[PDB]
Coordinates of C-alpha atoms and ligand atoms in Angstrom, one line a residue:
Chain A
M213 CA -120.4 -88.4 -49.5
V214 CA -120.4 -88.5 -53.3
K215 CA -123.3 -86.7 -54.9
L216 CA -123.8 -88.9 -57.9
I217 CA -126.1 -87.6 -60.6
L218 CA -127.0 -90.3 -63.0
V219 CA -128.3 -89.1 -66.4
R220 CA -129.8 -91.0 -69.3
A221 CA -129.0 -89.6 -72.8
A222 CA -131.6 -87.4 -74.4
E223 CA -133.7 -88.9 -77.1
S224 CA -131.8 -90.4 -80.1
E225 CA -133.2 -90.8 -83.7
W226 CA -133.8 -94.4 -82.9
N227 CA -135.6 -94.2 -79.5
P228 CA -139.0 -93.0 -80.8
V229 CA -139.5 -95.9 -83.2
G230 CA -138.1 -98.3 -80.7
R231 CA -135.0 -99.5 -82.6
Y232 CA -132.4 -101.3 -80.4
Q233 CA -129.0 -99.4 -80.7
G234 CA -126.6 -101.1 -78.5
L235 CA -123.2 -99.8 -79.5
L236 CA -124.5 -98.4 -82.7
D237 CA -124.4 -94.6 -82.8
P238 CA -127.4 -92.5 -84.1
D239 CA -127.5 -88.8 -83.6
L240 CA -129.8 -87.1 -81.0
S241 CA -133.4 -86.5 -82.4
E242 CA -134.5 -82.9 -82.8
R243 CA -136.6 -83.5 -79.6
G244 CA -133.5 -84.9 -77.9
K245 CA -131.4 -81.8 -78.7
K246 CA -134.0 -79.7 -76.9
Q247 CA -134.2 -82.1 -74.0
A248 CA -130.4 -81.9 -73.5
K249 CA -130.5 -78.2 -73.3
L250 CA -133.4 -78.3 -70.8
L251 CA -131.5 -80.8 -68.7
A252 CA -128.3 -78.7 -68.8
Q253 CA -130.3 -75.8 -67.6
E254 CA -131.7 -77.8 -64.8
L255 CA -128.3 -79.1 -63.6
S256 CA -126.7 -75.6 -63.9
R257 CA -128.2 -74.9 -60.4
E258 CA -125.8 -77.5 -59.0
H259 CA -122.1 -77.3 -58.2
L260 CA -120.6 -80.0 -60.5
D261 CA -117.0 -81.3 -60.1
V262 CA -116.7 -83.8 -62.9
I263 CA -118.7 -85.1 -65.8
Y264 CA -118.3 -88.7 -67.2
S265 CA -120.1 -89.8 -70.4
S266 CA -120.4 -92.9 -72.6
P267 CA -118.5 -92.0 -75.8
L268 CA -121.5 -92.7 -78.0
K269 CA -123.1 -89.6 -79.7
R270 CA -126.5 -89.6 -77.8
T271 CA -124.8 -89.7 -74.4
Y272 CA -121.8 -87.4 -75.4
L273 CA -123.9 -84.7 -76.9
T274 CA -126.2 -84.7 -73.8
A275 CA -123.0 -84.5 -71.6
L276 CA -121.6 -81.7 -73.7
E277 CA -124.6 -79.4 -73.1
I278 CA -124.4 -80.0 -69.3
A279 CA -120.6 -79.3 -69.6
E280 CA -121.0 -76.1 -71.8
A281 CA -123.7 -74.6 -69.3
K282 CA -121.1 -75.2 -66.4
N283 CA -117.8 -74.6 -68.3
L284 CA -116.6 -78.0 -67.6
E285 CA -115.0 -80.8 -69.7
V286 CA -116.5 -84.1 -70.6
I287 CA -114.5 -87.2 -69.6
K288 CA -115.3 -90.2 -71.9
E289 CA -115.7 -93.5 -70.1
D290 CA -116.1 -96.9 -72.0
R291 CA -117.4 -98.7 -68.9
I292 CA -120.7 -96.9 -69.0
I293 CA -121.4 -97.5 -72.6
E294 CA -124.6 -99.3 -73.7
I295 CA -124.8 -103.0 -73.6
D296 CA -123.8 -104.8 -76.9
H297 CA -127.2 -106.0 -78.0
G298 CA -125.7 -108.1 -80.7
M299 CA -128.2 -109.4 -83.2
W300 CA -131.0 -107.1 -81.6
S301 CA -129.0 -104.0 -82.7
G302 CA -131.0 -102.3 -85.6
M303 CA -134.2 -104.3 -84.9
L304 CA -137.5 -102.8 -83.8
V305 CA -139.0 -104.1 -80.5
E306 CA -141.8 -105.6 -82.6
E307 CA -139.3 -107.3 -84.8
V308 CA -137.4 -108.8 -81.8
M309 CA -140.7 -110.0 -80.3
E310 CA -141.7 -111.7 -83.6
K311 CA -138.2 -113.2 -84.6
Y312 CA -136.8 -114.0 -81.2
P313 CA -139.9 -114.3 -79.0
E314 CA -138.1 -116.7 -76.5
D315 CA -135.0 -114.5 -76.1
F316 CA -137.3 -111.5 -75.6
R317 CA -139.1 -113.4 -72.9
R318 CA -135.8 -114.1 -71.1
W319 CA -134.9 -110.5 -71.4
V320 CA -138.1 -109.3 -69.7
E321 CA -138.5 -112.1 -67.2
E322 CA -134.8 -113.1 -66.2
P323 CA -132.6 -110.2 -67.5
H324 CA -129.8 -111.3 -65.2
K325 CA -129.4 -114.5 -67.3
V326 CA -129.1 -112.8 -70.7
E327 CA -126.2 -112.8 -73.1
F328 CA -127.0 -111.3 -76.4
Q329 CA -126.1 -113.3 -79.5
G330 CA -123.0 -111.6 -81.0
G331 CA -123.1 -109.2 -78.0
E332 CA -122.6 -108.8 -74.3
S333 CA -124.1 -110.5 -71.1
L334 CA -126.0 -108.2 -68.5
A335 CA -123.6 -109.8 -65.9
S336 CA -120.7 -108.2 -68.0
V337 CA -122.4 -104.7 -67.9
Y338 CA -122.9 -105.1 -64.1
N339 CA -119.3 -105.9 -63.6
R340 CA -117.9 -103.0 -65.6
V341 CA -120.3 -100.3 -64.2
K342 CA -119.8 -101.6 -60.6
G343 CA -116.0 -101.2 -61.1
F344 CA -116.5 -97.7 -62.4
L345 CA -118.7 -96.8 -59.5
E346 CA -116.2 -98.2 -56.9
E347 CA -113.4 -96.2 -58.5
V348 CA -115.6 -93.0 -58.6
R349 CA -116.4 -93.4 -54.8
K350 CA -112.8 -93.5 -54.0
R351 CA -111.6 -90.8 -56.4
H352 CA -114.5 -88.4 -56.1
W353 CA -115.4 -88.6 -52.4
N354 CA -117.0 -85.4 -51.2
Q355 CA -117.7 -84.2 -54.8
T356 CA -120.6 -83.9 -57.2
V357 CA -120.2 -86.4 -60.2
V358 CA -122.4 -86.5 -63.3
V359 CA -122.5 -89.8 -65.2
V360 CA -124.2 -89.8 -68.6
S361 CA -125.2 -93.2 -69.7
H362 CA -127.9 -95.5 -71.2
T363 CA -130.7 -97.6 -69.9
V364 CA -128.9 -100.9 -69.4
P365 CA -125.8 -99.8 -67.7
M366 CA -127.9 -97.4 -65.6
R367 CA -130.3 -100.0 -64.4
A368 CA -127.3 -102.3 -63.6
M369 CA -125.8 -99.4 -61.7
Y370 CA -128.9 -99.1 -59.5
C371 CA -128.6 -102.8 -58.7
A372 CA -124.9 -102.3 -57.7
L373 CA -125.6 -99.2 -55.8
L374 CA -128.3 -100.7 -53.7
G375 CA -126.5 -104.1 -53.3
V376 CA -129.3 -106.0 -54.7
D377 CA -129.4 -108.9 -57.1
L378 CA -129.1 -108.2 -60.9
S379 CA -132.5 -109.8 -61.2
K380 CA -133.9 -106.4 -60.0
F381 CA -132.7 -104.8 -63.2
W382 CA -136.2 -103.7 -64.5
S383 CA -137.4 -102.2 -61.2
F384 CA -135.9 -98.7 -62.0
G385 CA -137.4 -96.1 -64.5
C386 CA -134.9 -94.6 -67.0
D387 CA -136.3 -92.0 -69.3
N388 CA -134.6 -89.8 -71.9
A389 CA -132.7 -86.8 -70.4
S390 CA -133.7 -87.8 -66.9
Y391 CA -131.5 -87.7 -63.8
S392 CA -131.3 -89.5 -60.6
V393 CA -129.6 -88.2 -57.4
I394 CA -127.7 -90.8 -55.3
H395 CA -125.7 -90.1 -52.2
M396 CA -122.8 -92.5 -51.8
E397 CA -122.3 -92.7 -48.1
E398 CA -119.8 -94.5 -45.8
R399 CA -121.9 -97.6 -45.3
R400 CA -124.5 -97.5 -48.1
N401 CA -125.8 -95.7 -51.2
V402 CA -129.0 -93.7 -51.2
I403 CA -131.2 -93.1 -54.1
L404 CA -132.6 -89.6 -53.1
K405 CA -134.3 -89.0 -56.5
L406 CA -135.0 -91.4 -59.4
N407 CA -135.7 -90.7 -63.0
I408 CA -136.6 -87.0 -62.6
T409 CA -137.9 -85.5 -65.9
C410 CA -139.8 -82.3 -64.7
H411 CA -137.4 -80.0 -66.5
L412 CA -138.6 -81.5 -69.8
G413 CA -142.2 -80.3 -69.3
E414 CA -143.8 -80.9 -72.7
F415 CA -140.6 -82.5 -74.1
Chain B
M229 CA -150.8 -103.2 -63.7
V230 CA -151.4 -101.1 -60.7
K231 CA -150.2 -97.5 -60.9
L232 CA -149.2 -97.0 -57.2
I233 CA -148.5 -93.4 -56.3
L234 CA -146.8 -93.3 -52.9
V235 CA -147.0 -89.9 -51.2
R236 CA -145.3 -88.7 -48.0
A237 CA -147.3 -86.3 -45.8
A238 CA -146.7 -82.6 -46.3
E239 CA -144.5 -80.9 -43.7
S240 CA -145.7 -81.2 -40.1
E241 CA -144.9 -78.7 -37.3
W242 CA -142.4 -81.0 -36.1
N243 CA -140.5 -81.8 -39.4
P244 CA -138.4 -78.7 -39.7
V245 CA -137.0 -78.9 -36.2
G246 CA -136.4 -82.7 -36.4
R247 CA -138.6 -83.8 -33.5
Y248 CA -139.6 -87.5 -33.6
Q249 CA -143.3 -87.8 -33.9
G250 CA -144.1 -91.5 -34.2
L251 CA -147.8 -91.9 -33.2
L252 CA -147.8 -88.4 -31.8
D253 CA -150.2 -86.3 -33.9
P254 CA -149.0 -82.8 -34.9
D255 CA -150.7 -80.6 -37.5
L256 CA -149.3 -79.7 -40.9
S257 CA -147.1 -76.6 -40.8
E258 CA -148.5 -73.5 -42.7
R259 CA -145.9 -74.5 -45.3
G260 CA -147.1 -78.0 -45.3
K261 CA -150.6 -76.8 -45.9
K262 CA -149.5 -75.1 -49.1
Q263 CA -147.4 -78.2 -50.1
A264 CA -150.6 -80.4 -49.8
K265 CA -152.5 -78.0 -52.2
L266 CA -149.7 -78.0 -54.7
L267 CA -149.4 -81.8 -54.6
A268 CA -153.3 -82.1 -54.9
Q269 CA -153.1 -79.7 -57.9
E270 CA -150.4 -81.8 -59.5
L271 CA -152.2 -85.2 -58.9
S272 CA -155.5 -83.7 -60.1
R273 CA -154.1 -83.8 -63.7
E274 CA -154.7 -87.6 -63.9
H275 CA -157.2 -90.2 -63.2
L276 CA -157.2 -91.6 -59.7
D277 CA -159.4 -94.5 -58.4
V278 CA -158.7 -94.8 -54.7
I279 CA -156.8 -92.9 -51.9
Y280 CA -155.6 -94.6 -48.8
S281 CA -154.3 -92.6 -45.9
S282 CA -152.6 -93.2 -42.4
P283 CA -155.1 -91.8 -40.0
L284 CA -152.6 -89.3 -38.4
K285 CA -153.4 -85.7 -39.1
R286 CA -150.2 -84.9 -41.2
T287 CA -151.1 -87.7 -43.6
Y288 CA -154.8 -87.4 -43.5
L289 CA -154.8 -83.6 -44.1
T290 CA -152.6 -84.2 -47.2
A291 CA -154.8 -87.1 -48.4
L292 CA -157.9 -84.8 -47.9
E293 CA -156.6 -82.3 -50.5
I294 CA -155.8 -85.0 -53.0
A295 CA -159.1 -86.7 -52.4
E296 CA -161.2 -83.5 -52.7
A297 CA -159.5 -82.6 -56.0
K298 CA -160.7 -85.9 -57.5
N299 CA -164.1 -86.4 -55.8
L300 CA -162.8 -89.5 -53.9
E301 CA -163.2 -90.3 -50.2
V302 CA -160.0 -90.9 -48.1
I303 CA -159.9 -94.5 -46.9
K304 CA -158.1 -94.6 -43.5
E305 CA -155.6 -97.4 -43.3
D306 CA -153.9 -98.2 -39.9
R307 CA -151.3 -100.5 -41.7
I308 CA -149.6 -97.4 -43.2
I309 CA -149.4 -95.5 -39.9
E310 CA -146.0 -94.2 -38.7
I311 CA -143.8 -96.4 -36.7
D312 CA -144.2 -96.2 -32.9
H313 CA -140.9 -94.4 -32.0
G314 CA -141.7 -95.2 -28.3
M315 CA -139.3 -93.4 -26.0
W316 CA -137.9 -91.2 -28.8
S317 CA -141.4 -89.7 -29.5
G318 CA -141.2 -86.0 -28.5
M319 CA -137.3 -85.9 -28.6
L320 CA -135.2 -84.0 -31.1
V321 CA -132.7 -85.9 -33.2
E322 CA -129.7 -84.3 -31.3
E323 CA -131.2 -85.2 -28.0
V324 CA -131.6 -88.9 -29.2
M325 CA -128.0 -88.8 -30.5
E326 CA -126.9 -87.4 -27.1
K327 CA -129.0 -89.6 -24.7
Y328 CA -129.2 -92.9 -26.8
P329 CA -126.1 -93.1 -28.9
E330 CA -126.1 -96.9 -29.2
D331 CA -129.8 -97.1 -30.1
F332 CA -129.3 -94.2 -32.6
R333 CA -126.3 -96.0 -34.1
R334 CA -128.4 -99.2 -34.5
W335 CA -131.1 -97.1 -36.2
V336 CA -128.7 -95.8 -38.8
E337 CA -126.5 -98.8 -39.2
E338 CA -128.8 -101.9 -38.9
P339 CA -132.4 -100.7 -39.2
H340 CA -133.8 -104.1 -39.9
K341 CA -132.8 -105.2 -36.3
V342 CA -134.3 -102.1 -34.6
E343 CA -137.1 -102.0 -32.1
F344 CA -138.0 -98.8 -30.3
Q345 CA -138.3 -99.2 -26.6
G346 CA -141.9 -98.6 -25.6
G347 CA -142.7 -98.8 -29.3
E348 CA -142.7 -100.8 -32.5
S349 CA -140.0 -102.8 -34.5
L350 CA -139.1 -101.9 -38.1
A351 CA -139.8 -105.6 -38.9
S352 CA -143.4 -105.0 -37.6
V353 CA -143.8 -102.0 -40.0
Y354 CA -142.4 -104.1 -42.9
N355 CA -145.0 -106.8 -42.2
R356 CA -148.0 -104.6 -42.0
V357 CA -147.2 -102.5 -45.1
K358 CA -146.3 -105.6 -47.0
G359 CA -149.7 -107.2 -46.3
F360 CA -151.4 -104.0 -47.3
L361 CA -149.6 -103.8 -50.6
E362 CA -150.4 -107.5 -51.4
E363 CA -154.1 -106.6 -51.0
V364 CA -153.8 -103.4 -53.1
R365 CA -152.2 -105.5 -55.9
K366 CA -155.1 -107.9 -56.0
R367 CA -158.0 -105.3 -55.4
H368 CA -156.8 -102.5 -57.6
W369 CA -155.3 -104.1 -60.7
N370 CA -155.6 -101.7 -63.6
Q371 CA -156.3 -98.8 -61.3
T372 CA -154.4 -95.8 -59.9
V373 CA -154.0 -96.0 -56.2
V374 CA -152.7 -93.1 -53.9
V375 CA -151.2 -94.1 -50.7
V376 CA -150.4 -91.3 -48.2
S377 CA -148.0 -92.3 -45.5
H378 CA -144.8 -91.5 -43.6
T379 CA -141.0 -92.0 -44.0
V380 CA -140.7 -95.3 -42.1
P381 CA -143.6 -97.2 -43.6
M382 CA -142.7 -95.9 -47.1
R383 CA -139.1 -96.9 -46.8
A384 CA -140.4 -100.4 -45.6
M385 CA -142.7 -100.4 -48.6
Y386 CA -139.8 -99.8 -51.1
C387 CA -138.0 -102.9 -49.6
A388 CA -141.1 -105.0 -50.0
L389 CA -141.9 -103.8 -53.4
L390 CA -138.4 -104.6 -54.7
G391 CA -138.5 -108.0 -52.7
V392 CA -135.3 -106.9 -51.0
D393 CA -134.0 -107.1 -47.4
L394 CA -135.2 -104.6 -44.7
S395 CA -131.5 -103.6 -44.6
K396 CA -132.0 -101.5 -47.7
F397 CA -134.4 -99.3 -45.6
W398 CA -132.3 -96.1 -45.8
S399 CA -131.6 -96.3 -49.4
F400 CA -134.7 -94.3 -50.6
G401 CA -135.4 -90.6 -50.4
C402 CA -138.6 -89.6 -48.9
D403 CA -139.4 -85.8 -48.7
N404 CA -142.5 -84.0 -47.5
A405 CA -145.3 -83.9 -50.0
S406 CA -143.3 -86.0 -52.5
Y407 CA -144.7 -88.7 -54.7
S408 CA -143.1 -91.9 -56.2
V409 CA -144.7 -93.7 -59.1
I410 CA -144.6 -97.5 -58.9
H411 CA -146.0 -100.0 -61.4
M412 CA -147.1 -103.2 -59.9
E413 CA -146.7 -105.6 -62.7
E414 CA -147.5 -109.4 -62.8
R415 CA -144.0 -110.6 -62.0
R416 CA -142.4 -107.5 -60.3
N417 CA -142.8 -104.0 -59.1
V418 CA -141.1 -101.1 -60.9
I419 CA -140.2 -97.8 -59.2
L420 CA -140.8 -95.5 -62.3
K421 CA -140.3 -92.3 -60.3
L422 CA -139.0 -91.9 -56.8
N423 CA -139.4 -88.9 -54.4
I424 CA -140.6 -86.3 -56.9
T425 CA -141.0 -82.8 -55.4
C426 CA -141.0 -80.6 -58.5
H427 CA -144.5 -79.5 -58.1
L428 CA -143.5 -77.8 -54.7
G429 CA -141.1 -75.3 -56.3
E430 CA -139.9 -72.9 -53.7
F431 CA -141.9 -74.8 -51.0
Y432 CA -139.6 -77.9 -51.4
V433 CA -137.6 -78.7 -48.3
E434 CA -135.1 -81.6 -48.0
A435 CA -134.5 -82.1 -44.3
Ligands
CL535 CL1 -133.5 -101.6 -73.3
CL536 CL1 -137.1 -91.0 -39.5

């Protein structure tokens, strides 16, 4: 099997105020930098074979702490980059709700149908992360793989892994510096642990 | 929303050797007794409104610790009882694999089509836990509900909660004295946390 460890980036400077980032690239927050160290300590217990990360700072810096703790390299991977939120990028959740209430409603209620104006469709995110996961399954069979990514590609990944409709997108928790443990087996994928944050304690 | 905390019984005497219990009723192991206390300690940190438990000892004893820590009464619920494993009940996994390889293969490969001889179907389990969850959603809106159950009903519950086929049965981890946090929202259910065992520390066993 593949032991797949799916990690969300530690907290960015934009997360606590709820500003959509998409492809935009803020640094980790001070809290985030601490979260990443704690997560790296937590994952140091495991034998790791490979670490993939979205190339954006928040993910890459999180990946780098895990790699440094285990003396591995980080392999950048564009296919697990955050969705292009288009015009939402730079906007607070409250601003989106006020300026684009109907688009916000579609996002919450029927995420699978969304295409961000000036940006990417959720279908597109699903396609790219699924392709990545298929290649990982083949290439890294019988290994432990860490994948450092963001909310939207991660939630799409859970849909692909379970073989469920993209409409189930919101049914998975995805907190900063969390990890999930998936076993990619011969006939199915198994979510053994989802959205673990215990290592963060107070953070 | 409903904050639904789905808990698997702490370790029974039969869990570490892999003997199928079903409706057979073994005690918690000494380790499991400690697990239940650690879990109860963990869940004592937040407000709980109601605790439902399968009436089998392994679940009920786990539920009793959580209930006592919060000044609640355990509500016995037959609809979250373990599947009737029928002829497998009392057999080790390796014995089942040896004696009934075809039925074991069906169990692993196509769980949604399984029915244990002298026992219950997986479809039956799905039906009864789904009805239970529907009633919980209506009765306990804006409350925190603990449900103490077993691997098979819990896995069926995840299928029902996600509104997905019973063929996804095996795709969810379910360890002794673990908890999952689900939000039952208006339009969907969200698995916020699945199969959390961090509170157990050195007393955590996968198996
Ligand atoms: Cl989001
Ligand atoms: Cl089982």
